Structure formats: C-alpha cells, structure tokens
Amino acid sequence: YNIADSNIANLGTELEKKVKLEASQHEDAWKGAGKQVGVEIWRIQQFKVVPVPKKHHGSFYTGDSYIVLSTYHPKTNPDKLAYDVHFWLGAFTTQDEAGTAAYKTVELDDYLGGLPVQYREVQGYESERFLSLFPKGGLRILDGGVETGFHHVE
C-alpha cells in the first residue's frame, strides 16, 4: 500500500517509542528495577504487577504468569548493566495473566530504553538461559496459583 497515507505511518518512529516510554513511567513496579546485578521477579495478580519476595525467587506457581528481570554486566564493560527479561507462563495460567505478562514485559523493556532482550518461557519449555538463573535445586514448580482477573461471561 502507501504506508505514509495509512494508519501505520507512525509505526517504528521515535514518536512511538517516546509515547510508550512515557506510559512505562506510570508503573510502580519498575521504580528502582535493574539497578544492580541480580534477578528481580514479579507475578501478575488480577492484572497487577506484584513483586515476588526474594526468598521465593525460583519457585513459580503453575497457575500463574511471571516477569523475571536478569541484570548482568556485559562483556563490553564490567561496570555497566545489560538485561535479559523472561516472562514465565505456567502450564495452567489463564489468558489474562499470560497476556498481561507479555504486555508488561514489553513495557519493562521500554522503561529500560529497549535494552532488555526478551524471552518467552512456557513451563516445560524454559530456555537454557532461564534454567541457568537459579542455583542447583532452585527452580521449583508449585501447585495452584492466584485467581484470574477475568470476569467470566456466562
């Protein structure tokens, strides 16, 4: 078609990135995120991004969806920070939770200037990078999970 005359004429622009960067400033969960080397974890709970306590990192409810930010020093500079962001989808998570985890992963990527590399991690399909995040015996799958945020239309 003629992209410039169309409703996708502003996709891929600095303006798109600027608008989405501003939106990411309105999520309390990202404040202070990615400031030092380590792993930060949030769980989606009825559309909200809720921190997971450090004592629970590596334990995931099979019914839920999570965002895992891994901050590390890149090979190029031992004093700077780079990011892998993994979203983990339990085998029994509901559609609202997985979709929010996906959207909010992009938003955390935006918040960090596009630097994070994204990884979709379905239970039982976790990447080598994801398996490497947790100490020996650290990755545990828990039964159950929090209730969906969806209202069910009968």
């Binding site: 169309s6 409703n7 996708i8 502003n10 559309f47 979709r120 239309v153």
Partner: protein, 363 residues
C-alpha cells in the same frame, strides 16, 4: 470506571467491557431498510426481519464507507445492546493495518463529538491478537469478513515495512460460494440470500489438504457431500463447493485476483523481516479471525509454508480455539492496564488538538 472494548469488524460487532473474558454483545454489522422502496433496523433485528429488508454493511474491507449507517451501528451498540451511556466509558476501538488515515480520524471525531466518550484509543487488530496468545514475538494472520492481514511483531513492536494486507476475506468467500452454487442450479442473489450462503459456508466449508486430490475424490463418489436445510424448508446438497470456496484464500485467481495466496503472503512477510528473527516468526504463526476457522486451514498452512521455507525450518501454526474473539480478548486485557490507558486520547486533548491527535497517540 470500566472501559468499553469494541472490535468493529467488517461483518460483526464484538463489544463488551474490559476485564470480561468474552464480548457480551456480538451481532451483525448491518443496517437493513425496506426492500420495497421504522426507517431502518440494525444488527440482530435486521437479520431477523431480512425477509422484507435490503441489508447493507457500513464497513467494507475494513474501511467505513457509510458513516451515517456506522453511527447507527455505534449508537445501537451503546444504547440498545450494552445499554450504557458512552459518555461514562473510555472506549477502545480497533482497526486493520494499512487503512487510510482518515478512517481513524473520523472514528475519533465521532466518538468525541457525537458520543462524548471521556477517552478513547484505536488499536491495530493483529497486535491485540498476539497479546491474547501470550506472546511478544510472532506473526499474526488475521482474517475477518473484510481484510486478511499479516503483521510480524518483534519484542512487542510491529514491523511496518513487513506488514501485508489483502482485501480478500470472508465476504468475498461468501460471494464466491453464492456464485459457484449456481452451477448446481441454485440461485442465491439477494442480500438476504447472501446471509443464508454465509451460514452454509460457516457450517459446511473446509480447506482441502490437497486441492486436486480432493476434487478427484468429489467426482469419484458422494462421500464429501453434505445437505443443508434452507429457511423455507428446501434441502440442498453441496459437494466440492465445500472446499472450492476457501481454496480462494490460497488461489485468489478463483475470484480473478492476481494476488499471492495467504500462505505466500505469510512467507513474503517473514522474508521482509531481518533474517535473525525469521526462525522465531516461523515458529509463531498465530491465526486470528473468523475466516481462519475453516477445518483444515492450519494443516494446509503448515504444508504450504513448509514448501516455501528452507527445508530445515521449524514451522508452527497456532490456532487458538477462541480466535473468533482473539482481537477483542487482547483488547479486554490491555484496556484493563492503567499504563495502557495512560496513552488514550482524553476529551480535553481532542478538544484542543482535533482528530490529528489519534496519529500521535495510537500505535
């Protein structure tokens, strides 16, 4: 404050409330008027009284071509179906990509000046479907009643140079089925009869895995034939029309279009993306929309893309069972997020900037 999500399809309105797991109102995007030349009827009621009405779709190939009738559709959606006051509800609308810019400009104007919504946003349909599937990377094939579009998305951003669009979708397939059913001596002509054939198509059509083999099977015996009871009680029989009709998606020359088929367009879209992300796109083809509901279409897409792609390429077609509603569901999810709503156009912003603001806020 609860946002409304309205996916205005070429064929069907899907409307409801953000946070619900399905649209609460789904009805034909049609206005009916007396066939003999109340004044008019909308939606389900026009369909019910179509015996005396001529039916018109205000949306053709994803574009609003009758704004007075589209205003009737929106009014009916708010006041008669959902029974809400639109001035109380931020509203999410949807659009196929590569629409002319003026379409969403007038959508924005009407929502604020006529319906007085407090806030609104216009989303690209395939992006909503990708999020409904729990992905940030993949390539969506969305096919409704008006448009088939391919949108590759990487880390949450659609790749505009690789977006593909074909103005060939469900309504063209219905029209083609009407045409070829005349070979059997059936005559489906009128706008009311088009709705009957649309139902035949939805109930009995399928995509053959090997078209030429299936044509031979259809001539060798009656094993593929199905019967269908018309509203007047007459029973008809259809045979190879069952799969010749959706074969048009793979062979657009069946209706005289020189276009690539949906398998080729999907492949062409992937090939317009950077080579290092192509494996991820091939493994994440997501089907969306009612015209992707034909039995056998995923298997046929798998076979055809395999023939086009490098011989070792891992290819996966994802066909969510709920994909008639995937766009709406993705909208319900995103419209439940305060950060997404932060990007919506407020009434004050519209008052000060006018319709042009939609291009600066909605991506």
């Amino acid at each position: 404050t609860t946002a409304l999500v309205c996916d205005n399809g070429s064929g069907l309105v899907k409307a409801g409330f953000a946070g619900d797991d399905a649209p609460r109102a789904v009805f034909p995007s049609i206005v009916g008027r007396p066939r003999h030349q109340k004044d008019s009827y909308v939606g389900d009621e026009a369909q019910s009284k179509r015996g005396i009405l001529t039916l018109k779709y205000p949306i053709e190939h994803g574009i609003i071509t009758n704004w007075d009738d589209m205003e009737k559709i929106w009014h009916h959606t708010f006041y008669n179906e959902l029974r809400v006051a639109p001035e109380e509800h931020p509203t999410l609308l949807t659009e196929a990509p590569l629409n002319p810019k003026a379409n969403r400009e007038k959508m924005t104007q009407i929502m604020f000046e006529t319906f007085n919504v407090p806030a609104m946003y216009v989303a690209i349909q395939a992006v909503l479907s990708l999020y409904a599937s729990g992905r940030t990377t993949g390539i969506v094939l969305d096919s409704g009643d008006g448009v088939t579009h391919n949108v590759p998305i990487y880390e949450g951003y659609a790749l505009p140079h690789a977006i593909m669009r074909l103005d060939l979708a469900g309504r063209d397939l219905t029209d083609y089925l009407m045409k070829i059913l005349t070979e059997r001596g059936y005559s489906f002509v009128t706008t009311a009869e088009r709705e009957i054939v649309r139902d035949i198509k939805e109930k009995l059509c399928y995509v053959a895995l090997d078209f030429e083999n299936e044509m031979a099977t259809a001539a060798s015996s009656s094993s593929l034939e199905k019967s269908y009871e018309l509203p007047d009680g007459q029973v008809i029989t259809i045979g190879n029309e069952r799969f010749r009709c959706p074969e048009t998606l793979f062979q657009p020359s069946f209706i005289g279009m020189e276009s690539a088929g949906i398998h080729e367009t999907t492949y062409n879209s992937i090939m317009k993306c950077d080579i290092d992300i192509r494996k991820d796109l091939y493994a994440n083809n997501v089907l969306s929309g009612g015209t992707t509901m034909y039995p056998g279409i995923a298997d046929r897409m798998q076979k055809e893309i395999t023939a086009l792609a490098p011989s070792t390429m891992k290819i996966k077609i994802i066909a969510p069972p709920e994909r008639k509603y995937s766009v709406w569901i993705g909208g319900s999810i995103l419209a439940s997020l305060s950060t997404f709503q932060q990007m919506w156009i407020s009434k004050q912003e519209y008052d000060e900037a006018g319709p042009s603001i939609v291009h600066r806020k909605c991506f």
